[PDB]
Amino acid sequence: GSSNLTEEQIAEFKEAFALFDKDNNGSISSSELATVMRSLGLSPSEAEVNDLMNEIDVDGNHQIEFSEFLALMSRQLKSNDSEQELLEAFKVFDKNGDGLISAAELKHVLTSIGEKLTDAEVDDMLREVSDGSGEINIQQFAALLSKGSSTGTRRKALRNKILAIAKVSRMFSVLR
Ligand SMILES: [Ca+2]
Ligand SMILES: [Ca+2]
Ligand SMILES: [Ca+2]
């Protein structure tokens, strides 16, 4: 499916899957899918959430599997993928709107999915692309999705959590 991911990469989307897959059964319902988006601050109607989750569903079982969702990440973006998922994950994380996703905006966001990082963990997570600043702009914040530096098949999944939160969140702007 025009996908070029490795066995290890398949373990990535897994994390982006848990975002919704609560019981981790292998199918993200509309009630679970919209559970994230809305958790981010969105408010997608079950009507759309369907046409959305049905826009990827390879079986149209009104649910997203670990294969479909993973195939989505490699079937959503196109050219300026990052950028796309950036501006999205950017205007998504920045709740205050200062062009810099502060700790909260980050952690709080990570907590909107389940990830509860300590003010220290977040304040540290920023340093990643915050050069020990305190916030991340469309530039720094993007430096994350495009980090792959000090990850070693670990962080790539940490930031991947945003890849979905963004993409998935962006899917609602496309489903339209
Ligand atoms: Ca589920
Ligand atoms: Ca499915
Ligand atoms: Ca801000």
CSV table of C-alpha atoms and ligand atoms in Angstrom, one decimal:
chain,number,residue,atom,x,y,z
A,1,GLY,CA,0.0,0.0,0.0
A,2,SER,CA,2.6,2.5,-1.1
A,3,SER,CA,4.2,1.9,2.3
A,4,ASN,CA,7.9,1.6,3.1
A,5,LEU,CA,8.0,0.8,6.8
A,6,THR,CA,10.1,-1.9,8.6
A,7,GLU,CA,8.9,-4.5,11.1
A,8,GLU,CA,10.1,-2.1,13.7
A,9,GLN,CA,8.2,0.7,12.1
A,10,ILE,CA,5.1,-1.4,12.5
A,11,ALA,CA,5.7,-1.3,16.2
A,12,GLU,CA,5.6,2.5,16.0
A,13,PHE,CA,2.1,3.1,14.7
A,14,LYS,CA,1.1,0.8,17.5
A,15,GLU,CA,1.7,3.6,20.0
A,16,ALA,CA,-0.3,6.0,17.8
A,17,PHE,CA,-2.9,3.3,17.9
A,18,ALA,CA,-3.3,3.1,21.6
A,19,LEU,CA,-4.2,6.8,21.3
A,20,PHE,CA,-7.7,5.5,20.8
A,21,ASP,CA,-7.6,1.7,21.1
A,22,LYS,CA,-8.3,1.6,24.8
A,23,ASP,CA,-9.0,-2.1,25.3
A,24,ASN,CA,-6.5,-2.7,22.4
A,25,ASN,CA,-8.8,-5.1,20.7
A,26,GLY,CA,-7.8,-4.2,17.2
A,27,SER,CA,-10.6,-1.8,16.2
A,28,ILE,CA,-10.9,1.9,17.1
A,29,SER,CA,-14.6,2.6,17.1
A,30,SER,CA,-16.1,6.1,16.4
A,31,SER,CA,-16.7,6.5,20.2
A,32,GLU,CA,-13.1,5.7,20.8
A,33,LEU,CA,-11.7,7.6,17.9
A,34,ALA,CA,-13.7,10.7,18.6
A,35,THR,CA,-12.5,10.1,22.2
A,36,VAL,CA,-9.1,11.3,21.2
A,37,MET,CA,-9.9,14.2,18.9
A,38,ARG,CA,-12.3,15.6,21.4
A,39,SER,CA,-9.8,15.0,24.1
A,40,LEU,CA,-7.4,17.2,22.2
A,41,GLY,CA,-10.1,19.9,22.2
A,42,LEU,CA,-11.9,18.9,19.0
A,43,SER,CA,-15.6,18.0,18.6
A,44,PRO,CA,-16.1,15.7,15.6
A,45,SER,CA,-19.6,14.5,15.0
A,46,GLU,CA,-20.2,10.8,15.1
A,47,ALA,CA,-21.6,11.3,11.6
A,48,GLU,CA,-18.3,12.4,10.3
A,49,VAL,CA,-16.1,10.4,12.6
A,50,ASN,CA,-17.7,7.5,10.7
A,51,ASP,CA,-17.1,8.7,7.2
A,52,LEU,CA,-13.7,9.4,8.6
A,53,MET,CA,-12.8,6.1,10.2
A,54,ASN,CA,-14.6,4.6,7.2
A,55,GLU,CA,-12.3,6.5,4.9
A,56,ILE,CA,-9.4,4.3,6.0
A,57,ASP,CA,-11.2,1.1,7.2
A,58,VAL,CA,-10.2,-1.5,4.7
A,59,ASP,CA,-13.2,-3.6,5.8
A,60,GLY,CA,-15.5,-0.7,6.7
A,61,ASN,CA,-16.2,-2.4,10.0
A,62,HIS,CA,-16.8,1.1,11.4
A,63,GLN,CA,-13.4,0.6,13.2
A,64,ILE,CA,-9.8,1.1,12.6
A,65,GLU,CA,-7.4,-1.8,13.0
A,66,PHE,CA,-3.7,-1.8,13.8
A,67,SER,CA,-3.0,-2.4,10.1
A,68,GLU,CA,-5.3,0.2,8.7
A,69,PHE,CA,-4.3,2.9,11.2
A,70,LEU,CA,-0.7,2.2,10.4
A,71,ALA,CA,-1.5,2.2,6.7
A,72,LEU,CA,-3.1,5.6,7.3
A,73,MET,CA,0.1,7.2,8.5
A,74,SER,CA,1.7,6.1,5.3
A,75,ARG,CA,-1.5,6.9,3.3
A,76,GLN,CA,-2.3,10.3,4.6
A,77,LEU,CA,0.6,12.8,4.1
A,78,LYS,CA,2.1,13.3,0.7
A,79,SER,CA,4.8,15.8,0.1
A,80,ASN,CA,5.3,18.2,3.0
A,81,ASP,CA,4.0,15.6,5.4
A,82,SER,CA,5.9,16.8,8.4
A,83,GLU,CA,5.0,20.4,7.8
A,84,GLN,CA,1.4,19.4,7.4
A,85,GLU,CA,1.4,17.3,10.6
A,86,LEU,CA,3.4,20.1,12.0
A,87,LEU,CA,1.2,23.1,11.5
A,88,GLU,CA,-1.6,20.8,12.7
A,89,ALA,CA,0.2,19.4,15.7
A,90,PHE,CA,1.3,23.0,16.1
A,91,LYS,CA,-2.0,24.8,16.2
A,92,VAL,CA,-3.2,21.7,18.1
A,93,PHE,CA,-0.7,21.8,20.9
A,94,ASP,CA,-0.5,25.5,21.2
A,95,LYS,CA,-3.7,26.2,23.2
A,96,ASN,CA,-2.5,29.7,24.3
A,97,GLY,CA,-1.3,30.6,20.8
A,98,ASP,CA,2.1,32.2,21.1
A,99,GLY,CA,3.8,30.2,18.3
A,100,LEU,CA,5.6,28.2,21.1
A,101,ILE,CA,4.2,25.1,22.6
A,102,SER,CA,5.1,25.4,26.3
A,103,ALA,CA,5.4,22.5,28.7
A,104,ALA,CA,1.7,22.4,29.6
A,105,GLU,CA,0.7,22.7,25.9
A,106,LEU,CA,2.9,19.7,25.5
A,107,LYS,CA,2.4,17.6,28.7
A,108,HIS,CA,-1.2,18.6,29.0
A,109,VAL,CA,-1.5,17.4,25.4
A,110,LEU,CA,0.4,14.2,26.2
A,111,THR,CA,-2.1,13.9,29.1
A,112,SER,CA,-5.0,14.3,26.8
A,113,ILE,CA,-4.1,10.9,25.3
A,114,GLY,CA,-3.0,9.2,28.5
A,115,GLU,CA,0.7,10.1,28.7
A,116,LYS,CA,1.2,11.9,32.0
A,117,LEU,CA,4.7,13.4,31.9
A,118,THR,CA,6.0,15.3,34.9
A,119,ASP,CA,6.6,19.0,34.6
A,120,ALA,CA,10.2,17.9,34.6
A,121,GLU,CA,9.7,15.3,31.9
A,122,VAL,CA,8.0,17.8,29.7
A,123,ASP,CA,10.4,20.7,30.6
A,124,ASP,CA,13.0,18.1,29.6
A,125,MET,CA,11.2,16.8,26.5
A,126,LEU,CA,11.3,20.4,25.1
A,127,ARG,CA,15.1,20.7,25.5
A,128,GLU,CA,15.1,18.1,22.8
A,129,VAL,CA,14.3,20.8,20.3
A,130,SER,CA,13.9,23.6,22.7
A,131,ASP,CA,17.7,24.0,23.0
A,132,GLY,CA,17.0,24.5,26.7
A,133,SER,CA,14.5,27.2,26.0
A,134,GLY,CA,11.1,26.4,27.4
A,135,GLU,CA,8.9,26.3,24.3
A,136,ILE,CA,8.9,25.0,20.8
A,137,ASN,CA,7.8,26.9,17.7
A,138,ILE,CA,6.7,25.6,14.3
A,139,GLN,CA,10.5,25.4,13.8
A,140,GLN,CA,11.5,23.7,17.0
A,141,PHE,CA,8.3,21.7,17.5
A,142,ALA,CA,9.0,20.4,14.0
A,143,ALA,CA,12.6,19.6,15.0
A,144,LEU,CA,10.9,16.9,17.0
A,145,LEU,CA,8.9,15.0,14.4
A,146,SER,CA,12.2,15.3,12.5
A,147,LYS,CA,14.4,14.4,15.3
A,148,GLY,CA,15.4,10.7,14.9
A,149,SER,CA,18.6,11.8,16.7
A,150,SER,CA,18.6,10.7,20.3
A,151,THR,CA,15.8,8.1,19.9
A,152,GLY,CA,17.2,4.7,19.1
A,153,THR,CA,13.8,3.2,18.3
A,154,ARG,CA,12.3,4.8,21.4
A,155,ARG,CA,11.6,8.5,21.0
A,156,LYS,CA,10.5,8.0,17.4
A,157,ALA,CA,7.5,6.4,19.1
A,158,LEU,CA,7.3,9.2,21.7
A,159,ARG,CA,6.9,11.8,19.0
A,160,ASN,CA,4.8,9.4,16.9
A,161,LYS,CA,2.1,9.9,19.5
A,162,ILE,CA,1.8,13.4,18.0
A,163,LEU,CA,2.0,12.2,14.4
A,164,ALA,CA,-1.4,10.6,14.9
A,165,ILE,CA,-2.8,13.2,17.2
A,166,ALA,CA,-2.0,15.5,14.4
A,167,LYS,CA,-2.6,13.4,11.3
A,168,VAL,CA,-5.7,11.8,12.8
A,169,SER,CA,-6.7,15.3,13.9
A,170,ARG,CA,-6.0,16.4,10.3
A,171,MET,CA,-8.1,13.6,8.9
A,172,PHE,CA,-11.1,15.3,10.2
A,173,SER,CA,-10.2,18.4,8.1
A,174,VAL,CA,-9.9,16.2,5.1
A,175,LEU,CA,-12.8,13.8,5.6
A,176,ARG,CA,-14.9,16.9,4.9
B,1,CA,CA,-10.7,-0.2,20.8
B,2,CA,CA,-10.8,-2.6,11.0
B,3,CA,CA,1.8,29.2,23.7
